[PDB]
Amino acid sequence: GNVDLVFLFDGSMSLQPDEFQKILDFMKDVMKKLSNTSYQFAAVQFSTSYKTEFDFSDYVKRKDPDALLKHVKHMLLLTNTFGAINYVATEVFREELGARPDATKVLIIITDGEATDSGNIDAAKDIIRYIIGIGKHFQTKESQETLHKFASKPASEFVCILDTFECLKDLFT
């Protein structure tokens, strides 16, 4: 089965340079691990606003993770995670941008959990949401509870940390 996976990465001011760099590295690693498969990728940076760094069509055209994230500039503003999730649900998974109608829609959200906005993400209900916690404050399962609201259910199976990203194991099959 085909899969359209979007990386939604936190680019807020709370991210230290080394941490933001770790996020970019993680995205590159995930893409190289799923190269030449039925997976197609898109990447969206979010802080106060939302920016599609590359879409599905760009991936098909260029393929190279290094060249795809080359123009990325750390936003360094707020953390509007809910607005970001909504932006992806309506502005990214579009046929005009290379999205396949039949493909399973997957979202890999990379953030430290703290959102500066609120609201509902019903427009993203049909998207499978995996949440990858950044930083050294998600060492325990209890601390990961703060990420539950953004993930698909059961939350315990769609939430993990940047270091190991064990919750993504099924994607690599």
CB of 138 to Mn ion, least distance (A): 14
40 vs 79, which CB is nearer to Mn ion?
79
d(CA 4, CA 53): 15
**DSSP H or E stretch at residue 106:** strand 104-111
With CB under 5 A as the contact rule, the residue among 23, 41, 75, 79 that binds Mn ion is: 79
With CB under 5 A as the contact rule, the residue among 4, 7, 12, 131 that binds Mn ion is: 12
Sheet holding 39-46, edge to edge: 50-54, 39-46, 3-10, 104-111, 128-133, 159-161
Listed residue (173, 153, 152, 172) closest to 164, CA to CA:
172
111 vs 144, which CB is nearer to Mn ion?
111
Stretch in the footprint of Mn ion (CB under 5 A) among 14-22, 82-90, 94-102, 133-141: 14-22
∠ CA 145-80-135, nearest 5°, is 50
With CB under 5 A as the contact rule, the residue among 14, 48, 52, 104 that binds Mn ion is: 14
Q: Is 49 in the site for Mn ion (CB under 5 A)?
A: no
Interface contacts to Mn ion, rule CB under 5 A: 12, 14, 79
